[PDB]
Symmetry: D3
Subunit: 243 residues, 6 copies
């Protein structure tokens, strides 16, 4: 049972038929692959590949991560499901896999996070640098991100060293989870939270579960659960629930 | 008669004499080209090319768009003329064609939009994905952008699926024409002709910005803006009257 | 003696020991290089290198800039020292040289700026274009940037043609030093020691006085006195501060 | 009508259907191309392309050669027909166009040869160098090669600066059309119409190989060869009579 | 129990410690690989990879042939064993896997041969074209090559469509197993077990070279050669007796 | 003074004005370079560069060789002078530096030879493997080559582990300095000074070719040759007197 994988294979076959100049891209990336994991690792490694460190090295490293962490198989599928559930602009499971840099960046972080805890700090920093340049997402490898994360549009995401994001969170573009203290100094974003475009959340503060942070908000103090905050500085302007 | 082409040709010629190391780039992109259209498609294809999908296939596919849409020839030139007229930092028609990712992003979108309407949705998504990563401009292929569009600096632009931008619009970096977050069906802004949108501005929801209006940098616009006004702030308020360029 | 360069070589040697698969990257960019300058020029050239204009051409041109501006040797070391002193997420001098695109964007501008003063505007604009696309930093070649500059995270930086930034300034991502809405000199002057918060927009022919701090998300449309903190849309003075 | 072209397009269509992963290669090289000329020029540019001199610059230059030498359209097709008639290992018109380096090298020579005449000697020598490295054919740009030329397998062919090859010749791999002692002047072979040159044959000096004759494999030819003979051995000696076909 | 595999890993580890700049190459090609088969496929795919057809697609296609053809695992190791035993210039099992183009060209043909039989003739001919350009070995995908084949130096190898090379054969560079002889049908040589073919030798026509025989460098062979002889000369003459060993 | 270098710079300058599209190539390879050494190292590294092992790593390793072997500065110049003096087909000192794979193969070998002597055997074999594939010259890094070596056309050169080539030797394409089949230690030829070796010639065994002698094209040399003679044939016989220069 892997309904997502078989959906993705069917989409890739139709796409190839529908546009056969894309067949090298679709066969290499989806159709020739033995699994969804290897198709995701392959695509991300090809986007991050560079003369400095080949796609192959990245792909091979990704594989060793997947072997030290077989639960990523589940997390990964939950992440794809998040996009499929939450983004109306895209209708296929194949879309975050092939196209969506936010999805690419999340799994890249998962790689660099694992590497970083292994003492492989340069590899992790390399991935961090490459993701920042190619996906425009600067996430410190020490950062903790939950499963079912939705990073929509993504451009300009900054996430600090001691930041934590829990499960089922949605983050848009232009968001900072940063400082400025110099110990634990970055936000903790509890489960189900939505963070709107351009929001700045600064300091070791907490954003309560199910809360919403309106676009352009500057959040300088903890936000309770089930509320909506907005503005510079952010004040409560509404109530909400984990919908 | 094509004064934009011939002036770009003479700009490239001087640039090569001035800096001979750039001769391969200037000849391949401009001087060896038979037309402005071909030069523009070449430059863009080269910026977007990747081992996943070669610049050649992008270039070839661009040309199929120009065949099916000859009016792109005119749209291309008014988009160049917009940069020439509105940006004081550059003085040559060649500058947007060679260097400015905003201009490249616009034409990329026009290709993707055409492809999307033809049912070639993976090709359109691929271009949108590549434009987002390379030009930092995330424009859904279903979005509708008019001619005379000036995308200045560009970085961080997001334009939603149901957005419409009319003619002679100018948009700065860090601009979102997006949704509130509910949110389905027509849920993205309508930007009427002559509008200027300042840096970092967020315009959210199926709301309209009336013709010839100006949105100051950093504004968060949640309700419709009438024509002929300037709005600023979080949330936006009308601060002044204003007119078209 | 060049303790910064000698620490980097040591950091890179241990790095390859620790992770040998990165040996090609680390030997090519650091250990094989005769100097810190050539390691920095080489990394930047590899990042910006493209079929259109090769890394080799970029690297060669960088060396000519170095040859013509000996003082860059000193400026480069103060910029590195700044990341080391001011950023708690990184512990090695090698970090900005290898990974930090803000650092790479600054030295890229110093090259484009020099080129642009030589009349080599196309080479200048090509660098500007590439840096805007690869490092997400759009700095006009005519802008002036002082030494000890720290560009943290960098993504979305926009710096206009007439902008001036003095020594020892720190600038976060999403910053605009731009204009609104004119003709000539229309861009800000950021005096020494200033800190500019994430997302902050500083527009027009205005100045931010020495040691001042602009908070995250501030929109600054009037000149800011020395030794203050400003915040808000639009910004107002919310405090007093000094240099460090 | 251009029957060769139309056959090639149909063959490329079937090929893509039979093995879709080859679709990018087959579309970019054949199906997206507007003419046979452009398909051939494109494939060759891609094979020769390098970071030193991009495929694009090679492809643009080639197109410049075609404009100044409209005769090439014909030469190209008779070269292709030569392969289709003389090689039993291949059944399709597109085989030479996509795959056969001997064919690629002849058309590279034609480009180099024209450049050379134009005083563009670096570009000529660059192609010669790249062809020698990638197709293993070293042909001096000053060499003259006729049409209906068949370079079968090709590896290790060397053709001297003053060599001439007439129409309808077939040359195998390992063939030297080379020099003898030193000497500076006219010093390489003139090969007349219809000659077949066997594998590994060495033909040295300003000597002539007459109309319709056959050099067997491994022959060392140091003296002129009459028309309508077959020669063989070291030193090459006549062994039979032969004619054209 | 894969003593070849285990020695190769150990050679790669030592080589990386000895020359750390080669670490990316040796990790990616050896030490990050799960098997000898995947390392050999990877190396070959990287050497033949091109923007026309990526290394990735080659590697994926290779892995498919391994799947459908489990026999190759054995043929591969008797090939590698052939090199270790027969070449005095190289001391490691890692050497053919990484460096030796003759070894690469052999395994490449085995892929192309399989594809050709599946009806994927274009992919077979692309591999043939690419091998001929990069390894200088032109082997028709319909040629039948036995196990334990040693191709030493390789440059200039040409093997016709109807050729058959039996097991335990050694072939030097510059060798042709070719035709006369565009007669169509069965028209290329049949080389029997244990044969040694010297540099430069040309074997032409549907003829046979019998077991354990030795063809001296430069020989031109136009008629069947019996078992257990050494032939030499242009034309080739039996000059002696020889045993297998 | 360094007249070779100055002449190359002037040639380069002239070439770029003659053909501006080649400016990126000619600046990056010659005009932007501070020495002849660095120009030659750069060209070779760019031809040999691959995703497996970047041109930068090769170029940096070549620098290391130069740092330890300042003597190569002279060896390099006399190698360039050999081409200028001996090849009537090219009139500029720049020609071998840019174009001639035989000259590139020589300096590649000198690097590989030095690495091999340092115990960096894998880097040495990789260079040997790459040169074989890209220049078609298979030279074992343990071979000793003197200065003033002219490798004309080069395709198919094979030089064995224990071969020695003394100064001012000229070797054509298709040449083997190899072994016979009774191999142990020294099993490859010794070519003394001033020898000319003709195209396709095979010199097999631990035999010696004496001073100023000439080996005619196609020859198979199986026993030692005294000084001041020409040999020819299969196998080769002394056919006259000669004397070199
Ligand atoms: Mg390509
Ligand atoms: Mg092409
Ligand atoms: Mg190059
Ligand atoms: Mg590759
Ligand atoms: Mg030559």
């Amino acid at each position: 049972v892997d309904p997502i994988w078989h959906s993705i294979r069917a989409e890739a076959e139709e796409a190839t038929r529908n546009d056969p100049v894309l067949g090298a891209f679709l066969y290499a990336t989806i159709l020739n692959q033995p699994s969804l994991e290897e198709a995701v690792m392959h695509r991300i490694a090809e986007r991050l590949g560079h003369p400095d460190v080949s796609a192959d090295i990245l792909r091979q490293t990704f594989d060793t991560m997947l072997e030290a962490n077989p639960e990523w198989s589940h997390v990964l599928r939950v992440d794809i499901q998040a996009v499929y559930d939450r983004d109306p602009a895209y209708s296929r499971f194949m879309d975050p896999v092939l196209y969506l840099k936010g999805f690419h960046a999340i799994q890249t972080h998962r790689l660099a996070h694992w590497l970083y805890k292994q003492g492989r700090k340069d590899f992790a920093y390399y991935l961090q640098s490459r993701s920042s340049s190619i996906f425009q997402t600067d996430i410190h490898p020490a950062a903790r991100l939950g499963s079912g994360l939705f990073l929509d549009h993504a451009t300009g995401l900054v996430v600090g060293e001691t930041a934590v994001v829990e499960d089922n969170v949605s983050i848009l573009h232009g968001v900072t989870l940063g400082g400025t203290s110099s110990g634990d100094r970055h936000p903790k974003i509890r489960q189900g939270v939505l963070i709107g475009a351009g929001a700045k959340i600064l300091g070791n503060i907490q954003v309560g579960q199910c809360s919403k942070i309106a676009a352009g908000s500057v959040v300088l103090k903890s936000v309770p659960h089930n509320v909506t905050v907005a503005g510079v500085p952010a004040r409560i302007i509404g109530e909400t629930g984990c919908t």
